[PDB]
Design a protein around this ligand. Structure first.
Ligand SMILES: [Mg+2]
Lengths: 147, 46, 302, 50
RNA sequence: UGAGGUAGUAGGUUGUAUA
DNA sequence: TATACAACCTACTACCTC
């Protein structure tokens, strides 16, 4: 009566040569495979953007839970899980002034080029005219650049 | 996994080991099952 | 979509990893709307949000969270995706590659340098571009593992004509085999369960023929005690279009490819990731003007 | 060097029989390893037995 | 664009057969 | 160079969140 065949679920190798089927559970138990000592971040956006990013980092530095913990496993915490330091103290700010956006945004083909030019030129001049090291750049888009 | 059950020193050779050579999670679960069986005391999100 | 893709392409010009985060995602309780109700309520998935964001940040900073272990050694998986540009209406092809060798290390990159095709339809490649694609992939594999692959596993969302396969066989070395697989994701089959009120379990496959089959990549997963979809799960069609291969190894490889998704922290996804990442690469590359040699690493794109 | 003939017994009793057997066997020309006669002093108790 | 999914709405190519 | 039809292909908006 049209028999069905069953294929097993693959296994992904976490640290210590161990195997699991859910990345969340394996990460919480064993941990990542390689050692990068830290994540030095960089923030581009308004002052409120920096405040929001700092508050979110402070929140994720400590354990968080969900409603149920079988469907969605809890969060032990960044340093407990990944063993890396990603803190708000080491942030390289690059502020976008309110007047800049309020004059530069207000044909929807040139505005979306101009704003990208703004953010990208800030990122590039930070990358080429600074001594600090940033591995990942964060772009905190305000609530008016998307609508 | 490279040490057979027939090469143990003669002090624990008569006791049954807990399997930890394939998956650490299952061995740890066996440890907790035994600990609950023998009423080992614990003091408690655990 | 203009903002994200343009930013990522113009920074791809300079090879700078980046991540875009809206203010509403990070601070959702503040952006209230319609009488004190957040537009998006992360009141019960905040841990999942943290999981996803932290995993993405960790991957973009140069770390691998996990790796694949159960994949056949000595094969290459290529995923071809066609994106139409109507700025002549050319069709651009971008690929992603994945192979494992010399230490159980998974090398997941994207073969780029989009090869175009100047027809309105015709989601296919001319012989020259196909030869260039295969030569680049084989040279990358040989550079990494100091030897040529024993087999090549080419899959795409479309089919292959005889022109492409003839070119591919022309550039293929003496002892390398090619297999063509097509993964269609909308063919109307639905297997309702007779008794329970929960969907069909994931991992079930129907072998209609020696070269075609269905696969359930969604549905109820026992470990999570929930479903990876909504309504009734939709299977995905698998066909061995060209070349000789078994229909079981193909399905195992498809599941293995559906495992790894570094952009999100989930149990699995419906479609293999080699095609989704290739599609993202395609959008980013066609959003720009012109790039001579684009970076292959996935951090700059995703 | 599989020539020794191991003999096991109980500690407090069943020692006289073991001594008699070991002496007779050594007199007959075999090689016998026993806890009574052999197992020189100051040696690890169980490693040598194993 | 933190992500996943389900649907809807539009078009287009090929293959006959026509004029 | 178009009317009608099967078989495939992509591309947007809008709504849920287990
Ligand atoms: Mg992402």
């Amino acid at each position: 009566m049209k028999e069905l065949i069953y294929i097993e679920e693959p296994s992904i190798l976490f640290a210590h040569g161990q195997k699991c089927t859910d990345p969340r559970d394996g990460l919480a138990l064993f941990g990542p495979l390689n050692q990068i000592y830290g994540i030095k971040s960089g923030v581009v956006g308004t002052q409120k953007g920096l405040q929001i990013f700092k508050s979110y980092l402070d929140k994720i530095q400590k354990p968080i839970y969900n409603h149920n913990n079988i469907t969605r496993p809890m969060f032990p915490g960044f340093e407990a899980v990944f063993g890396c330091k990603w803190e708000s103290q080491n942030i390289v700010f690059k502020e976008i002034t309110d007047e800049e956006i309020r004059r530069y945004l207000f044909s929807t083909h040139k505005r979306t080029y101009d704003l990208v030019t703004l953010f990208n030129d800030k990122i590039i001049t930070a990358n080429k005219n600074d001594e600090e090291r940033v591995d990942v750049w964060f772009v905190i888009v305000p609530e008016e650049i998307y609508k | 996994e490279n040490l057979s059950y027939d090469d143990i020193n003669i002090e624990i050779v008569r006791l049954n080991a807990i399997d930890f050579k394939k998956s650490w999670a299952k061995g740890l679960q066996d440890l907790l099952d035994a600990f609950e069986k023998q009423n080992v005391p614990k003091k408690p999100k655990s | 979509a203009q903002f994200h893709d343009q930013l990522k392409a113009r920074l791809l010009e300079h090879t700078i990893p980046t991540q875009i985060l809206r203010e509403s995602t990070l601070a959702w309780r503040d952006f209230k709307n319609t009488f004190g109700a957040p537009i998006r309520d992360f009141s019960k998935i905040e841990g999942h949000l943290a999981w996803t964001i932290s995993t993405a940040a960790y991957y973009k900073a140069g770390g691998k969270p996990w790796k694949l272990g159960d994949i056949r050694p000595g094969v290459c998986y290529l995923g071809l995706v066609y994106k139409k540009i109507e700025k002549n209406p050319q069709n651009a092809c971008c690929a992603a590659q994945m192979f494992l060798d010399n230490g159980d290390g998974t090398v997941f990159k994207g073969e780029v340098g989009p090869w175009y095709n100047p027809e309105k339809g015709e989601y296919h490649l001319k012989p020259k571009e196909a030869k260039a694609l295969l030569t680049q992939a084989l040279e990358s594999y040989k550079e990494q593992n100091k030897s040529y692959p024993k087999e090549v596993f080419i899959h795409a969302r479309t089919r292959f004509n005889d022109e492409e396969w003839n070119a591919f066989n022309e550039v293929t070395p003496k002892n390398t085999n090619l297999v063509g697989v097509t993964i269609t994701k909308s063919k109307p089959l639905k297997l309702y369960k007779t008794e329970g009120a929960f969907p069909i379990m994931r991992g079930n496959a129907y072998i209609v023929d020696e070269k075609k089959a269905f696969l359930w990549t969604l549905g109820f997963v026992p470990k999570l005690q929930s479903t990876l979809s909504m309504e009734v799960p939709n299977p995905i069609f698998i066909e061995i279009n060209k070349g000789e291969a078994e229909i079981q190894q193909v399905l195992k490889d498809i599941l293995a490819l559906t495992k790894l998704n570094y952009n999100a922290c989930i149990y699995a996804d419906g479609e293999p990731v080699t095609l989704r990442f290739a599609n993202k690469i395609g959008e980013i590359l066609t959003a720009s003007t012109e790039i001579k040699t684009p970076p292959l690493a996935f951090k700059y794109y995703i | 060097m599989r020539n020794k003939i191991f003999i096991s017994h109980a500690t407090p009793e069943d020692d006289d029989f073991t001594r008699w057997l070991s002496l007779k066997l050594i007199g007959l020309g075999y090689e016998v390893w026993c806890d009574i006669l052999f197992l020189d002093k100051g040696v690890d108790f169980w490693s040598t037995i194993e």
